[PDB]
Amino acid sequence: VTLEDALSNVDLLEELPIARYIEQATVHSSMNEMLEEGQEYAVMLYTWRSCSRAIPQVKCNEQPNRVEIYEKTVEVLEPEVTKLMNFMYFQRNAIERFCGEVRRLCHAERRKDFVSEAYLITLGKFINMFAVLDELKNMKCSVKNDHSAYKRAAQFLRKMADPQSIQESQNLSMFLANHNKITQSLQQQLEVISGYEELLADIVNLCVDYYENRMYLTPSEKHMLLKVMGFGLYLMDGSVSNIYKLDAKKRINLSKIDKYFKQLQVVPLFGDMQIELARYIKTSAHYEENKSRWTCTSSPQYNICEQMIQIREDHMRFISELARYSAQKTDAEYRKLFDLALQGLQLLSQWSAHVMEVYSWKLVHPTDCPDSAEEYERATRYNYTSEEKFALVEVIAMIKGLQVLMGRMESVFNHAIRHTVYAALQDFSQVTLREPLRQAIKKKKNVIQSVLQAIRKTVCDWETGHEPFNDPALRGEKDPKGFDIKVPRRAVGPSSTQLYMVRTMLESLIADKTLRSSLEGPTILDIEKFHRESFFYTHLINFSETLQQCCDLSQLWFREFFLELTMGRRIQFPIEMSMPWILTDHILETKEASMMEYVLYSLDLYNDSAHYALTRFNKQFLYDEIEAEVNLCFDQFVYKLADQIFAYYKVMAGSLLLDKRLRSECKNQGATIHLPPSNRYETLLKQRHVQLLGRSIDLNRLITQRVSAAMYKSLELAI
Amino acid sequence: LRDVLSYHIPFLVSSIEDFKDHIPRETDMKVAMNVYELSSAAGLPCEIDPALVVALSSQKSENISPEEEYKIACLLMVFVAVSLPTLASNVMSQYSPAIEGHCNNIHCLAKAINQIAAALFTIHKGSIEDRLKEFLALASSSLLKIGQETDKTTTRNRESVYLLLDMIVQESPFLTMDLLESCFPYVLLRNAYHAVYK
Amino acid sequence: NELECVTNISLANIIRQLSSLSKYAEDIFGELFNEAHSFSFRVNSLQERVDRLSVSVTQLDPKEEELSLQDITMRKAFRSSTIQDQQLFDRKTLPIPLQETYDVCEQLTPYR
Amino acid sequence: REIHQDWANREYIEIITSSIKKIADFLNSFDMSCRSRLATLNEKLTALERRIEYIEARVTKG
Amino acid sequence: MAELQMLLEEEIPGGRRALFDSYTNLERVADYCENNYIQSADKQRALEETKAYTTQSLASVAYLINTLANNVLQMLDIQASQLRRMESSINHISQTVDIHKEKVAR
Amino acid sequence: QAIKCVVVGDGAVGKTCLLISYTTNAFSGEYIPTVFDNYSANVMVDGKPVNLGLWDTAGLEDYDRLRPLSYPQTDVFLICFSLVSPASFENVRAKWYPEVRHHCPNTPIILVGTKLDLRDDKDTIEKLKEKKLTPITYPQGLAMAKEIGAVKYLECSALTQRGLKTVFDEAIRAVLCP
Ligand SMILES: Nc1nc2c(ncn2[C@@H]2O[C@H](COP(=O)(O)OP(=O)(O)OP(=O)(O)O)[C@@H](O)[C@H]2O)c(=O)[nH]1
Ligand SMILES: [Mg+2]
């Protein structure tokens, strides 16, 4: 009935046991909607499976069911040509809009006007979308064969087809025929515009600054920056623009890119596929005569075993510092929570990046193990050592352990984040902007006046509902000496539109006479300080979404890329070559006590993969495959676990009851009886919340059944 | 003794087990002590040891009063908890899998604290679960503090003391893993187990 | 003002989220009630068996006891139940919420 | 001014959303806790069922 | 004993029916308030009305959850108590059987 | 990494059944004429991954206005003739050697026969004898391939897939290695 009364009922449950940026804002949004549609076309291609095999084959022309087999093929593969039509139409329009946007922004006005930073990142994501889509089209093969079968079936039935239909079908075949069609079309339509290299250089420079300054929070963004830099360099080379001349002009620095490529060589485009960042350089037109400049091509630091000491130390110190933080407090406490949450997310992203990059590198570099084996077998199973597998599961367990802790504190985190952002923004606008406003008022700076007033009017909150009339800054005269103002305090974050607008205006004041030439030292120092500190505000407001995205490891199971390369002789790889089973099997077979308790954290990866597929891929056969794999995987895990538990306890009892004098005498003679190493089955036995595929499994019951059968067998054998 | 008596006088042992297990909780302490004494004579694992209570009840001096004795007992746990981290600097506190404990016999402090606390707070009528909860909270806070820094000499065997806290919770029946998780993540214990096993 | 309209839309979304939370609680309570109801039936059946056994065991006459020959092993040796649960992750045993997440997503032998 | 009204309205939304999240978090925790209690209850029930069956077989005549 | 069957088939089914009715009410009220805000000449009154409705819904939902949780906990506790009483009876029967067997052996 | 292959030849010589069998592992007898088609494969040759785009060209006289545009920006050329059709064999000398060379003079050419399984069949050769035609033999292809300067001469049979893996394997070996 009232907010307070509703909150009291909820509490009872807890105890139970300017129009210039408006125009740019609209353009930025239009590009964003297109990128989402592009990812949907990219997902559609990745989840493509050969549907032509199930179509019956015809061996003679007199078959009574020839006509009907053709009807069938057509119905079945009709919904698949329609989406191909849409995809070709979408990419054609997307390229046209991108080229037109560059045409608008490459005019001579560029020499005076500056361009926003989020916009450049959006453009980088745009070209990355083109690159991934081109790779999907190039590598996929079942699409072309399926279309060819449909075309032949339609011709045989002559489904009353017309002039335009055949023209479109021929065009689509050629479109899928051409190698790197998307890249070639984009380059051809972009080379006509003069100065496009300068804009590409700005995007590359922005990516370098972000990467160097750790201006990211998720591994996806980290990999995107490298991919954008590589693709931008490839586009720069051509008949009009040369990278080497630009580098000699100081416009672009290639040493930083070379070092980054050397440190990190493989990044994931989409799914199990990987891209070598050095491939773009290799494909550069002018690379042949100047290959000495780049040293990243030649191939040492991916051994995760030697990188675990720092991970363990960082994990312990963060947990120890955080465990003590498990009715209003000072702003310092909220700021500490803000910092702690950021540190935790950064650490999780670093761990996730390490695991994924190692996996990608191993896949790209297969070994050279029996004589006969599939590419997946060589790429994953035989490229991993016992120490490597233990380290990977250790990192996975740490990631999940920290993830669950942060989720529990989500409520406290959210309150602290909202309180801090509101206080920092209001204090900055209401205090830090007074001095620049006074200087602008004293000496006519109308350009500065508009931006400052817009910033101080879009987001500022006034306790009395109106701006004070006694402010010396507004009148332009120097303030006395204080005119202190008490800003309101509350827990709510700025809206996305407000945050974007204020940031754009704030960063427009600082740019490369210029508008920054009329500002003193301290005024700017605060301006850039706020600019570099407010980037994570939007990320931290949606804490739950950021945390799950940062701790995503659903790409360790999908293998559709390798299935296509098996020439369609395989429906799905056997459980032996999947990563989660290999890690679990290795732990069980080795029976290592140290890693015994980490098995569960290596078995719930299926839940993450299933959630990712259902939420993003919107496909069902992947979910069915996961369930089938888990069905037998769990049974094998239970069977092995019960057998080793019974054997370990039986030997322990026998050794414990054995005489000690005989053992000592045997040891002296030289026939000592080795003791049984201890293990840590204590945690596994007590587990009763094994959550898998949205199901609750009682591991204790299954172990009890196996042990009871074993005990009965032993007693019968004894008699 | 329990194992020997199981196959010697099963009828008496079975009657004792039923008598002890199904004893109502609302009964007075005198009858419960009588049952425990008989149960102890049979070798059963009673939570409260009547012999310890009897031995600890024969003490008196000039300045002894019920209120100050209760305060002393409450303060004893605080002193033990605050002194627990000091064991991290001991060389002989190296946990080893072959022993499932420590070379300096610090793994028996868990049952010592539980038995001492139960006997002291059943003599003085004070609650046990609340007192043990406070001891665990203080220990967890201090154990987190010592693990925050990185001094080599002072934190040579920080993992060993972490396992002691796990042993205290496991052995203690009045303490549940839920309380430890709230005040101490199980992740640290898991890492400690891996490090020692190596 | 567009701000007022945006707020009202947010309130409507909040109501939708509250309704979703209500469903997320109804299914859990229903599942637990159905499961616990089964346990009630099992307990009641066991209670009847124990009552019958107690009546039967309090009637034994010691003089009625008889022993068979030492060389007779024809008696059917008693065997305990040994049912081990398997195929746990099966399509049929899927939680209703998973079913909605399933059907919402996307979905020739005679002529072969 | 409209800005102040928007801030107040958004504060109303923020507290309501936090209340919704708290209810969901409790609901998940309650489901886990009840299931664990349910599982241990089943463990004892099946053990009792086995024991009574053994007793009946031991005492049954014929 | 009677209180058990009472809450089995009178409490939980009623709560589920109330939850379903609440869901329909939540959907209907949201549509009505949104349609009222657009149509109504005055917007502040509409904003207040929807604020009252959502608060009423939140309080009702929390109340329904609390009573259901309390009922489930109560039902579980009585089931556990019944099981413990059952275990004692079984143990007594087992003890009676074993003494009966020793007397026959003697 | 990516190799572009275009197959040319006379009509009804077995280029669709050849490509279809290689990619889908299936064969058929129906003859659906082909204005244009496209097929793809991903096979490893000499221990490296190679992407094999395949381009199918109509050989029928009328559809000569879509054939030239598939020639440029290619790597290898495939010429297919039916072992049981002397007319196609002579067409290679009269044409498909100038046509490819004129558009692409410095590209390697692969010459391979087709319908190997039918060469030993008595019924088909007999009917060809009523036409006063005799099937082609192995040495004849060697001379023709040497005359046109092709890398190799091979033979294939889609129905039996006896030499259909080799032809594509050697075509990649012809461009990637030299
Ligand atoms: N016995 C046998 N028949 C074949 C073989 N390959 C193709 N055929 C038959 O030859 C017919 C026509 O040959 P295609 O493979 O369609 O010829 P094409 O290269 O596509 O030439 P176009 O006539 O221009 O379409 C098919 O319908 C089959 O019946 C083969 O290896 N063996
Ligand atoms: Mg054809």
Best mutation site among F5, F30, F31 for ligand 1 pocket (most ligand atoms within 8 Å of CB): F31
B-A interface (Cβ pairs under 8 Å ≥ 3): yes
- Is position F17 annotated in a ligand binding site? yes
Query: Going by C-beta distance under 8 Å and a sequence separation of 6 or more, which residues neighbour residue D59?
Result: C53, C56, C57, C60, E97
Q: Which residues of E touch D59 (CB under 8 A)?
A: 97
Contact D25/E63 with Cβ under 8 angstroms?
no
Contact A259/A208 with Cβ under 8 angstroms?
no
* Strands (DSSP E) found in F83-148: 109-114
Angle at A534 between CA A331 and CA A513, to 5 degrees: 130
Q: How distant, in Å, are the alpha carbons of A150, A178, A569, F5 from that of F39?
A: 13, 12, 17, 10
* Binding-face residues of E in 20-59 toward D, CB within 8 A: 47, 51, 54, 58
- Chain D's closest residue to A700, CA to CA, is D43
**What tokens appear for C9 in the block?**
């839309």
> How many Cα neighbours within 13 Å face the side chain of A488?
14
Angle at A383 between CA A378 and CA A387, to 5 degrees: 150
Long-range contacts of F159-166 (CB under 8 A, 24+ apart): F159/F27, F159/F117, F160/F116, F160/F117, F161/F21, F161/F25, F162/F116, F162/F117, F163/F116, F164/F18, F164/F21, F164/F22, F165/F22
- Residue B104: which region, alpha, beta or left (left: phi > 0; alpha: psi -120 to 50)? alpha
- Residue B105: which region, alpha, beta or left (left: phi > 0; alpha: psi -120 to 50)? left
Q: How far apart are CA A232 and CA A206, in angstroms?
A: 12
DSSP characters over A298-323: ------GGGGHHHHHHHHHHHHHHHH
Cross-chain CB nearest to B22 (options E88, E95, E99): E88
Pocket of ligand 1 (CB under 6 A): F 11-17, 29-31, 33-34, 58-60, 114-115, 118, 157-159
A309, A324, A682: which to substitute to probe chain B, counting the most B Cβ within 10 Å? A324
Burial A441-456 (b: 16+ CB within 10 A, else e): beeebeebeebbeebb
CA of A580, closest CA in chain B: separation in Å?
A: 20
Look up tokens 């009204």; give the residue: D5
Phi, psi of B121 (to 5 degrees): -85, -10
Alpha helix stretches (DSSP H) within chain B = 2-6, 10-21, 29-41, 50-56, 66-83, 109-123, 129-148, 158-171, 177-183, 186-197
Check B185 against A401: CB less than 8 A apart.
Answer: yes
Contact F174/F151 with Cβ under 8 angstroms?
yes
CA of B30, closest CA in chain A: separation in Å?
A: 31
Burial B86-110 (b: 16+ CB within 10 A, else e): ebbebeebebebeeebbeeebbebb
Measured from the Cα of F34, ligand 1's closest atom is 25
- Is position F15 annotated in a ligand binding site? yes
SS3 at position A559: coil
How many angstroms is it from F35 CA to the middle of ligand 2? 7
Contact D21/A411 with Cβ under 8 angstroms?
yes
Q: How far apart are CA A605 and CA A554, in angstroms?
A: 7
Q: Which residues of E touch A3 (CB under 8 A)?
A: 55
Phi, psi of F4 (to 5 degrees): -100, 125
Angle at A296 between CA A291 and CA A298, to 5 degrees: 80
Contact A614/C94 with Cβ under 8 angstroms?
no
How many angstroms is it from F5 CA to the middle of ligand 1? 19
Nearest Cα neighbor of A25 from A647, A496, A716, A655 is A496
Phi, psi of A492 (to 5 degrees): -160, 140
Contact C39/E79 with Cβ under 8 angstroms?
yes
Query: Going by C-beta distance under 8 Å and a sequence separation of 6 or more, which residues neighbour residue A239?
Result: A191
Check D52 against C18: CB less than 8 A apart.
Answer: no
Contact F67/F34 with Cβ under 8 angstroms?
no
Q: How far apart are CA A413 and CA A333, in angstroms?
A: 11
Beta strand pairing call for F153-154 and F36-45: unpaired
- Residue E9: which region, alpha, beta or left (left: phi > 0; alpha: psi -120 to 50)? alpha
Long-range contacts of C42-49 (CB under 8 A, 24+ apart): C42/D45, C42/D49, C43/D45, C43/E79, C43/E82, C43/E83, C43/E86, C46/D45, C46/D48, C46/D49, C46/D52, C46/E86, C47/E82, C47/E86, C49/D52, C49/D56
Contact A363/A379 with Cβ under 8 angstroms?
yes
Contact A268/A356 with Cβ under 8 angstroms?
yes
Contact C50/D59 with Cβ under 8 angstroms?
no
E-A interface (Cβ pairs under 8 Å ≥ 3): yes
Q: Which residues on adjacent β-strands are paired with residue A103?
A: none
- Is position F59 annotated in a ligand binding site? yes
Amino acid, res. C28? I
Burial B124-141 (b: 16+ CB within 10 A, else e): eeeebeebbbebbebbbe
Q: How distant, in Å, are the alpha carbons of A183, A496, B110, B126 from that of B115?
A: 77, 59, 9, 14
C51: domain range?
1-62
H or E element at residue A690? strand A690-692
How many angstroms is it from F14 CA to the middle of ligand 2? 8
Contact B196/B95 with Cβ under 8 angstroms?
yes
Alpha helix stretches (DSSP H) within A297-409 = 308-323, 331-364, 375-376, 386-408
Q: Residues in chain A, how many?
A: 719
CA of A322, closest CA in chain B: separation in Å?
A: 9
Helices and strands in chain A: count of H runs, count of E runs: 32, 4
State the chains in contact with C (3 or more Cβ–Cβ pairs under 8 Å).
Answer: A, D, E
Query: Going by C-beta distance under 8 Å and a sequence separation of 6 or more, which residues neighbour residue A446?
Result: none
Helices and strands in chain F: count of H runs, count of E runs: 6, 6
Q: How far apart are CA A345 and CA A468, in angstroms?
A: 41
Check A397 against B150: CB less than 8 A apart.
Answer: no
Query: Going by C-beta distance under 8 Å and a sequence separation of 6 or more, which residues neighbour residue A684?
Result: A596, A597, A599, A600, A641, A645, A699
Contact D34/E72 with Cβ under 8 angstroms?
yes
Cross-chain CB nearest to C21 (options D9, D20, D59): D20
Check E104 against C62: CB less than 8 A apart.
Answer: yes
H or E element at residue A68? helix A66-76
How many angstroms is it from F28 CA to the middle of ligand 1? 8
CA of E93, closest CA in chain D: separation in Å?
A: 8
**What tokens appear for F31 in the block?**
């003859």
Contact A453/A493 with Cβ under 8 angstroms?
no
Query: Going by C-beta distance under 8 Å and a sequence separation of 6 or more, which residues neighbour residue F38?
Result: A144, A147, A148, A173, A176, A177, F53, F54, F55, F56
Q: How far apart are CA A506 and CA A220, in angstroms?
A: 27
Angle at A180 between CA A177 and CA A182, to 5 degrees: 100
Helices and strands in chain E: count of H runs, count of E runs: 3, 0
* Strands (DSSP E) found in F29-75: 36-45, 48-57
Nearest Cα neighbor of F23 from A174, C109, A565, A153 is A565
Check B193 against A594: CB less than 8 A apart.
Answer: yes
Amino acid, res. A650? K
Q: How distant, in Å, are the alpha carbons of A579, A588, A589, A617 from that of A636?
A: 15, 10, 12, 29
Contact C15/E26 with Cβ under 8 angstroms?
yes
Q: How far apart are CA A693 and CA A688, in angstroms?
A: 15
Give the number of whichever ligand sits closest to the CA of residue F161: 1
Give the number of whichever ligand sits closest to the CA of residue F31: 1
How many angstroms is it from F17 CA to the middle of ligand 1? 6
Q: List the domain boundaries for chain F.
A: 1-178
- Structure-solving method: cryo-EM
Q: How far apart are CA E65 and CA E15, in angstroms?
A: 9
SS3 at position C112: coil
Q: How far apart are CA B170 and CA B174, in angstroms?
A: 10
Measured from the Cα of F80, ligand 1's closest atom is 19
Best mutation site among F5, F6, F7, F16 for ligand 1 pocket (most ligand atoms within 8 Å of CB): F16
- Chain C's closest residue to D15, CA to CA, is C14
Q: Is E91 on the interface with A (CB under 8 A)?
A: no
Residues around ion ligand 2, judged by CB within 5 A, are F 16, 34
CA of C89, closest CA in chain E: separation in Å?
A: 27
Q: How far apart are CA A395 and CA B56, in angstroms?
A: 50
Contact A563/A570 with Cβ under 8 angstroms?
yes
Total domains in chain D come to 1
Q: How far apart are CA A391 and CA A701, in angstroms?
A: 31
- Chain A's closest residue to D12, CA to CA, is A3
Phi, psi of A217 (to 5 degrees): -130, -15
CB pairs under 8 A between A and C: 66
Q: How far apart are CA A382 and CA E96, in angstroms?
A: 64
H or E element at residue A172? helix A163-177
Angle at A501 between CA A497 and CA A503, to 5 degrees: 120
Q: List the domain boundaries for chain E.
A: 1-104
Check D55 against E47: CB less than 8 A apart.
Answer: no
DSSP characters over A225-258: HHHHHHHHHHHH-SSS--HHHHHHTTS--HHHHH
Beta strand pairing call for A695-697 and A274-276: unpaired
- Is position F13 annotated in a ligand binding site? yes
- Residue A195: which region, alpha, beta or left (left: phi > 0; alpha: psi -120 to 50)? left
Q: How far apart are CA A147 and CA A176, in angstroms?
A: 10
Nearest Cα neighbor of D33 from B178, C94, C20, E80 is B178
Q: How far apart are CA E98 and CA B193, in angstroms?
A: 46
Cross-chain CB nearest to C10 (options D13, D23, D48): D13
CB pairs under 8 A between A and B: 57
Q: Which residues of A touch F28 (CB under 8 A)?
A: 57-59
Nearest Cα neighbor of A678 from B196, B191, B172 is B196
Amino acid, res. B119? A
Q: How far apart are CA E37 and CA E33, in angstroms?
A: 6
Q: Output Rg (C-alpha) for chain E, integer angstroms.
A: 27
SS3 at position C7: helix
| Resolution value, angstrom units | 3.0
Contact A88/A170 with Cβ under 8 angstroms?
no
Query: Going by C-beta distance under 8 Å and a sequence separation of 6 or more, which residues neighbour residue A693?
Result: A606, A607, A610, A626, A627, A630, C89, C94, C98
Q: How far apart are CA A691 and CA A697, in angstroms?
A: 7
Q: Which residues on adjacent β-strands are paired with residue A276?
A: A266
> Residue B59's CB: how many other CB atoms inside 10 A?
9
Contact B128/B174 with Cβ under 8 angstroms?
yes
D53: domain range?
1-59
